[PDB]
Symmetry: C5
Subunit: 28 residues, 5 copies
């Protein structure tokens, strides 16, 4: 349902954010 | 309702955060 | 109540994070 | 529980916000 | 259950995000 799906989308986006930040940290 | 809408707002803000971070990463690659 | 308020606080903090990141991105563009 | 997970999330988000402010400050 | 677990996963990811940001801040201070 809508709530479950929103939470899953949030989790997915958070993983992307975490990965991009790791890439940024790596270069510094 | 209020809970559903808060969660949707959170999801939207997270997408913006993800996009801005991609822009930042792009310039540093 | 407590759950609703926590979620609202989370949403607010996410917006702050998004704004600060936009500031960071702006200087690097 | 759920309440506790949400509280932990809120706390972590505050730390994230603070660290980002520190980062932004040095670049300002 | 599924909701509880999603929230726990989110919390874990947020901890990773917090740590990486601390590393970034450390190099810039």
């Amino acid at each position: 349902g809508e709530i479950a799906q929103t939470l899953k989308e949030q989790a997915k986006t958070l993983k992307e954010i975490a990965w991009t930040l790791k890439e940024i940290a790596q270069t510094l």
